[PDB]
């Protein structure tokens, strides 16, 4: 696949097109290394804090048992009395190499809907089961902040890895075999000019010999 006509000026044009494509690799490959290095270090933060929430949720589950030993059964009092949320999230923005990363930030508009739960039997095992689970949603939001950054990075590092390889396989070899066509077609004009000029000199000796 060739593009345009060889003129001695297109060769400088095609070398300028090749120069931008040569620096279109390394300037975009190192972006794909900057994204992958954060993508690999987020995965280590994924694996480490996922076995860390498993210990916290195990501790919160044993706290639950303790609360039920002390204080009746709350599997209908807690479920029925929900009206509004006490823990909410707001989506914040972050970036690595110009790739906007969605991230989550938690905040408490605290109006305690379980301000009086137990209060006659228990209520001391409660408000530390609440503390064992508000610390759990403190961590599960921080893990989900790494979850939604992980899932949008590889779908944005696949589109960068294709744009590198489309340069390396489709654009750079097309310019380079265009540039090879400019060289051999310009050499073919130089033999045509050599054959014409030598033929004039051969005819110039013919007229000189008779005259």
């Amino acid at each position: 696949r060739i593009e345009i006509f060889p003129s001695r000026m297109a060769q400088t044009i095609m070398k300028a097109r090749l120069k931008g494509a040569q620096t279109g690799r390394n300037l975009l490959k190192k972006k794909s290394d900057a994204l992958t290095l954060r993508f690999r270090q987020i995965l280590k933060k994924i694996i480490e804090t996922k076995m860390l929430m498993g210990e916290v949720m195990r501790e919160a589950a044993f706290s639950l048992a303790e609360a039920k030993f002390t204080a009746g059964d709350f599997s209908t009092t807690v479920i029925q009395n929900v009206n509004k949320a006490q823990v909410k999230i707001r989506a914040k923005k972050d970036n690595v190499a110009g790739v906007t990363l969605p991230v989550f930030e938690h905040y408490h508009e605290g109006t305690d809907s379980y301000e009086l739960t137990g209060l006659a039997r228990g209520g001391e095992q409660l408000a530390k089961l609440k503390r064992n689970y508000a610390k759990a949603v403190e961590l599960l939001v921080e893990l989900a902040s790494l979850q939604t950054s992980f899932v949008t990075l590889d779908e944005a590092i696949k589109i960068t890895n294709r744009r590198v390889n489309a340069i390396e396989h489709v654009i750079i070899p097309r310019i380079e075999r265009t540039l090879a066509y400019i060289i051999t077609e310009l050499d073919e004009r130089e033999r045509e000019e050599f054959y014409r000029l030598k033929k004039i000199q051969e005819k110039k000796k013919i007229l000189k010999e008779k005259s």
């Binding site: 690595v96 190499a97 050599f194 000199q201």
Partner: protein, 250 residues
Amino acid sequence: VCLFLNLANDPTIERIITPRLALTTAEFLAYQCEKHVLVILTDMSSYAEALREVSAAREEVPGRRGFPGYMYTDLATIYERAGRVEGRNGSITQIPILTMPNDDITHPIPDLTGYITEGQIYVDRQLHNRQIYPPINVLPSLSRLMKSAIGEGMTRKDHADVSNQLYACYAIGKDVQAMKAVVGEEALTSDDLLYLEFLQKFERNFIAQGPYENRTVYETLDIGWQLLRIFPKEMLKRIPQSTLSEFYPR
């Protein structure tokens, strides 16, 4: 100085006899009067259009790109009048300054002098538009006989390693200079920030020197050690510890 002018008015046949004149006087001062002569030939690109012009005056058919076929021989008659000889104390070295047309090295004027000379020095338009004098970039430049020139008795012992390290940190510092643009000033680490601060002082204190400042070869290496002292130890991997122990603490 034995300065030989040749302007654009005076004839083009005199451009051919001009470096033959200049090297004849530089073969009488060197190894006939036994002194070291530095020959500067400029412009060596303007020599070849004078060589092209008298060629067509002889009704000779032009070779590749109009330049004659015997140009590699004709450039050899004036480039190879150099070197030093056995029983004589003088020497002769050449700096043939030439301009490549349309910044193309594939052109026969910087190509036929690349087969025959011993390394190149590059004057680039990138550093010239940045107002850096002299605009010499040292990544594509090379001196093929610089291993022989420098040494212990010749300049001093650390020359082979401070130049190897200044070339390495400038190459790495040029790579991190683009990641400040495309990745981010905050994402780059503390060591890559140090290569950023090296390159800003390398191009302004080592390379840029002004048209009247004659730094000797000892003042050159002292400026080079000031730009290597901003780096800590164990990054200067091109310098062995036998010379790094003295010149680094100062």
